[PDB]
């Protein structure tokens, strides 16, 4: 169970954590391995046809060793990935967006402006 | 524009607008109004399909005279309505859900424990 908030501001992924921490929650995660949110969560996001962030990145192991921000391994063969996606260079500082394009993860530089989604596990 | 928080945790209707407020937030409300923001949010109750309370009762008016708490007029004939209602008696206290049997709006007793929908506009 969950309690989860959409927000329309765009922010980097820095901004979009520390956002989600003032309110007393964590960008999406655990969320986002739970066969049920997950569904709901998309289902949002796929009517509003825009880029989200999500709490996943390579910044602590590097190249595609992507982290939720819990610690838990978002596996590189994820069916949570877009097509042919994770991409870009491993030697970048790569953080995990839900991308309109294909309304599924995929793999970008920390510095653009995207909505975010927070969660917090009920409890 | 707006935030969007949803929860699982289930409460009556003066529960439900206590948490929101208490959050800097509104039970939702305008957002239901916009065509985007609503079928947004209509796609995620549908995956869970659950009752969810939504902003509007006739606590003011009383009977068929619905209205969101931000004093807008939730027409007794809106599209927005579960087919074959509104349709309780008129003379009770009467909120309003998003009721599971359609995804849809329908009036019911304020008492039930239902999810939450909470809204914040954005400038
Ligand atoms: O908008 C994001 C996209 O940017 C492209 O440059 C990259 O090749 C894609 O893999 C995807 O990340
Ligand atoms: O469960 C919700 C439903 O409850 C019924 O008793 C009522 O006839 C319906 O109009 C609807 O409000
Ligand atoms: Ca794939
Ligand atoms: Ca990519
Ligand atoms: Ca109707
Ligand atoms: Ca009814
Ligand atoms: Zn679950
Ligand atoms: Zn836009
Ligand atoms: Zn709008
Ligand atoms: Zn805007
Ligand atoms: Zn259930």
Redesign the interface.
Known sequence: ?????????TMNYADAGTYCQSRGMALVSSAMRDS?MV???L??????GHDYWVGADNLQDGAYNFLWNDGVSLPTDSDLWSPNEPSNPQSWQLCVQIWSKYNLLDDVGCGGARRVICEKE?D
Do not use: G, N, R, W
């Not at 169970?1 to 501001?9: N, T």
């Not at 289902?43 to 509003?48: D, G, H, L, N, Q």
């Open positions: 169970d969950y309690e989860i908030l959409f927000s329309d501001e049920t569904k709901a969560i289902a949002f996001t796929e009517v509003k009920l």
